[PDB]
User: Fold SH3 and cysteine-rich domain-containing protein 3 from Homo sapiens.
Amino acid sequence: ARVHRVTRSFVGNREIGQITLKKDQIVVQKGDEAGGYVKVYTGRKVGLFPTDFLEEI
Assistant:
């Protein structure tokens, strides 16, 4: 499992599949990055999030 900490809060555009996450939230990567985004799982929801705002733990 690739597990990441959110480094900066980000409001996602849900119309295009992005997710809102808060700084310091922990998420699990699902699949590979593309175009600056990656799919992540919060434990309740899945969506796309900017890879620049993730740090692997």
The chain has one domain: 1-57. The two ends are 10 Å apart (CA to CA).
